[PDB]
Symmetry: D2
Subunit: 150 residues, 4 copies
């Protein structure tokens, strides 16, 4: 079962999150967790009017029951006065790592499953563990055959 997320819906959720992050003066900038948090971070930057947008690149490859993660690029700092945004939190593996790198940052996401829900400071939509979130950047408008060939 999949939870389809179109661009329009994502933008709606992002604006709802931005309204909570007001005022925008309390924020020095935004730290987007590449690559998923890039689009939501761009949207928050637009709504809050933040021009200082940085990133934290962390690749993770699962090997059976253990994860091998490495920070390809890291934003200098502790996240003091910064908003760390990611598209979603599933198991919370990434969230835990991010919180250790930027403990003084306001960690937020758009979607949050039950596992990673206690790790984020704020989120917008609740999604089940068994439900797979299909993001807009992974989809596209293409031809789809009729249910029937009548």
């Amino acid at each position: 079962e999949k939870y389809i997320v179109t661009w329009d819906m994502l933008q709606i959720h992002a604006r709802k999150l931005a309204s909570r992050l007001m005022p925008s003066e309390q924020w020095k900038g935004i730290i987007a967790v590449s690559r998923g948090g890039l689009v939501p971070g761009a949207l928050l930057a637009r709504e809050l009017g933040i021009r200082h947008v940085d990133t934290v690149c962390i690749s993770s490859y699962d090997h059976d029951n253990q994860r091998e993660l490495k920070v390809l690029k890291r934003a200098e700092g502790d996240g003091e006065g910064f908003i760390v945004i990611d598209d979603l939190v599933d198991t919370g593996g990434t969230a835990v790592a991010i919180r250790e790198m930027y403990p003084k940052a306001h960690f937020v996401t758009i979607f949050a499953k039950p596992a990673g829900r206690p790790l984020v400071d704020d989120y917008v939509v609740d999604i089940p563990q068994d439900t797979w979130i299909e993001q807009p950047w992974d989809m596209g408008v293409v031809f789809v055959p009729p249910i029937s060939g009548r």
Copy 2:
């Protein structure tokens, strides 16, 4: 409170309803309830491959009386009657009367009008206004600042 429905999502729901109407060979045609059922009817017609698409136009006049501007012929046997949603089921009662043998379906359905439909896709609260795609558009929205 409001419930926003984009074209993409409406089509996703239409395709789910279309799958439940299979096989398409059991249907003679589709009667769309103007104007709400026009788009959903067009989507079903595409998915099921039904080319016989007709319409039923109803207008409103102490009491609120119904007025049939245009009507599709028949009692609805072998036809699908489609409307975008059922709130209280006022218009739903009128359609049921005209096409008793038809398979009345909608995309959305609120608690009050839920019993009047043969099938629907999404449940919506009674107090929630469903904002359909044909009433919206992509325009400039000022930053929250």
Copy 3:
């Protein structure tokens, strides 16, 4: 070669067409050519406030170099005071047939190719003959694999 038409864009064109059809008081109703003109007709009906929407169902069948036309259902009258709308005109084969059924009707479409262009009373977008118009109702938002497996 192809031309992609999203729901948003189709609606933009439909609203532009509705503007030229004003005032709406001069129209008795709308006759949509199923199935292509169904969505465009619905949009016009909403924009113009027309509640009288009817249809004309004509089935085609290409048998080599000749067409087999069969009218499944048709609106009454000659289209006097009515707006007959279809999504597009390619060769103009359908347009000719419809114009002969409703001679007093204002025939309009959203898209128009050079061949059928002279057959309509009004249209919105010019499309080349070699270009295939991909309508929204034939498409859908689904997963699309990355251009590379990096």
Copy 4:
């Protein structure tokens, strides 16, 4: 003139056509997105090309430029992306900072078209490009009341 409307779907289509030109992907070390216009396009290229190293370059006006933050290096092996190039004001500044970088944009106007290595859509000098992140689906009253 008038306004060139760009929806999310269309922007993504242009982004994919650009991505196919930047192949192979192995020739790139990373992507430098120009804040804030190149953030979304940069995210789409990163997904299509499979590049996980994405940095940013933030510039503010006051005109003389001001670098709020800048990515490291001369941009050798990197792709610098912005959503568009109008006159090339900010483009000239990017060239100076990341000389050995491959500068690309989605849209390009006559005046700024030379200052970029590659783009996808040509837009007139007097036409205002309305980006998706500045718009939203809201209720739009019917043309006729």
